[PDB]
Amino acid sequence: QTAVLNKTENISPVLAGGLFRAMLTGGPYPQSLLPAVLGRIRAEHARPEDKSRYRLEVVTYYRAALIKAYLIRNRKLEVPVSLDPARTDRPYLLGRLFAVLEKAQEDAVPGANATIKDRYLASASANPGQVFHMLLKNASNHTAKLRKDPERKSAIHYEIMMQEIIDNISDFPVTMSSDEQGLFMIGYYHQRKALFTKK
Amino acid sequence: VSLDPARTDRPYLLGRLFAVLEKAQEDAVPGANATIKDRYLASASANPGQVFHMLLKNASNHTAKLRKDPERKAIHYEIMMQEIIDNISDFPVTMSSDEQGLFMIGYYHQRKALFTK
């Protein structure tokens, strides 16, 4: 999963040895793992031309599992196995918010080629304070369209989510560290699964 | 974290003021197709000095309808506006990105309070 292209030829020997050693002995993982996965996450851009009509995900099951394991072992943090609505960590909260924004957009404009995930995933995780205002501003246009629908479809529900999540934040940070970006990714992954999971 | 009535950060106060104005308009003309949030949200956050002098006119125009009915819900808004503006000194001509983020945060904090019991 960490190869440049998903092919065994590009696997770094250092990781090959270190992962096996740590697995057998229970020692700390190699320190280069987290940046290695983050690079692959931030570089990939799948497109609809792939055979599967729905576009490919980049935050896959395996990568999330790896990040969780790394954070638990080396950094001594705590991470739930599924969404926890009482976390209150700024990276986690931002990761949660991104998912609802994308969900609203993709409902407002079906079949778009370029979603916010295709244009803002990297910078938003790196420098939250520089991009988030634009995303919030566009969310207004996206939501208002649903409101005027005869059925009103969603509109109230998404705004309720946005209000409740935001209530625990005070300011947008200017910069974040690597582990903070890992928390951001985990938060995004959990929230995404929370949707699509009433029926 | 929740609405802090003592923060006194100018973008925060502006964000609160915008939410209260939107609430007043919604009360005045139910079911409007277009709302100030759609018309002005982009402009106000970037250049406050250009639009607020206009929003405040419609504010009074709306409150006039309510105060002219037996609907007494209608000096509450005027009291809130007096409280909020009491800390401002001047309107910025332009604002930075992080300041706009703080503006949005203040807006959302304010909005939630209005819908509590």
Binding site: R119, A122, Q130, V131, V174 | A42, A46, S96
Partner: protein, 286 residues
């Protein structure tokens, strides 16, 4: 290819009006900035591209001035030309394991292509021709003050595909900088020129390209951009006589008397140059 015999430093100034000097592919398309202070940034590769374009336009494929054509080219097909010209047969991933012919291909490349002779390149691909370092180098350009981008909304009369809106049909966006002034540094090394053969006439052509860079670069999003100043420091021997950072300090820029808040023209700033150490010659009429 007689090389130059001195060390050089130089400074360049330019500004923009109502345009986007360089967009950021990873954040919508905003101009590049420093996230911590709001100063603008421009990558050197942009300036290198502009210089290459100007040289190609002015020389038009003359002998020994091929630009290593980059637009839609395939590089290995160019390396194989060097291999065949020297009558060698390329190996799967290695230079010929015979020293004389190994450098002959590299010398051939260096002779024919101007941009290789000036900036260098990497050619260790499946067909191998070696590496080059390049006498000329440049650093990132940085603005003198924070900039405040503006975002403007646009509309359109038509749609591209089968959208069932049915009149007004679409909306767009732009980002522009009302005004800004930038500064750039650079260096030239004599020992490397002695290896690639970078010569004086090339230096003259380089000065000309720097002066006339933007004249041919008009575009819908660029706006108006132009150059304003150019200062050159020439050392008196093959190795410098002073540290560069001391030299760069002799140039100072600040607001004129009528600051009047926002700057909107080159007249709002003042530029001055100090006195150089005895071992260095300073010429600024360029």
């Amino acid at each position: 290819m007689t090389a130059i015999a001195n060390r050089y430093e130089f400074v360049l100034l330019f500004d923009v009006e109502n345009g986007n000097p360089n967009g950021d592919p990873d954040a919508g398309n905003m101009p590049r900035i420093d996230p911590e202070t709001g100063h603008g940034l421009v990558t050197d590769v942009c300036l290198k591209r502009k210089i290459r374009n100007h040289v190609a336009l002015t020389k038009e494929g003359a002998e020994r001035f091929n630009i290593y054509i980059q637009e839609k080219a395939i590089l290995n097909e160019t390396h194989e030309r060097a291999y065949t010209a020297c009558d060698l047969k390329p190996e799967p991933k290695k230079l010929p394991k015979k020293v004389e012919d190994a450098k002959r291909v590299t010398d051939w490349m260096c002779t024919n292509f101007y941009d290789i002779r000036t900036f260098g390149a990497v050619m260790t691909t499946e067909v191998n021709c070696g590496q080059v370092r390049g006498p000329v180098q440049m650093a990132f350009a940085r603005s003198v003050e924070p900039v405040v981008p503006q975002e403007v909304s646009i509309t359109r009369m038509a749609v591209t595909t089968k959208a069932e809106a049915e009149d007004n049909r679409t909306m767009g966006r732009k980002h522009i900088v009302p005004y800004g002034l930038y500064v750039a540094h650079g260096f030239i090394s004599a020992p490397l020129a002695e290896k690639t053969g970078f010569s004086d006439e090339d230096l003259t052509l380089f000065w000309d390209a720097l002066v006339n860079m933007f004249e041919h670069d008009r575009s819908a999003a660029r706006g108006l951009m132009s150059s304003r100043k150019l200062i050159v420091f020439k050392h008196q021997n093959r190795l410098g006589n002073a540290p560069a950072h001391k030299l760069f300090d002799l140039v100072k820029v600040s607001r004129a008397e009528g600051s009047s808040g926002p700057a909107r023209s080159f007249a709002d700033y003042a530029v001055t140059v100090g006195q150089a150490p005895e071992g260095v010659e300073v010429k600024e009429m360029l």
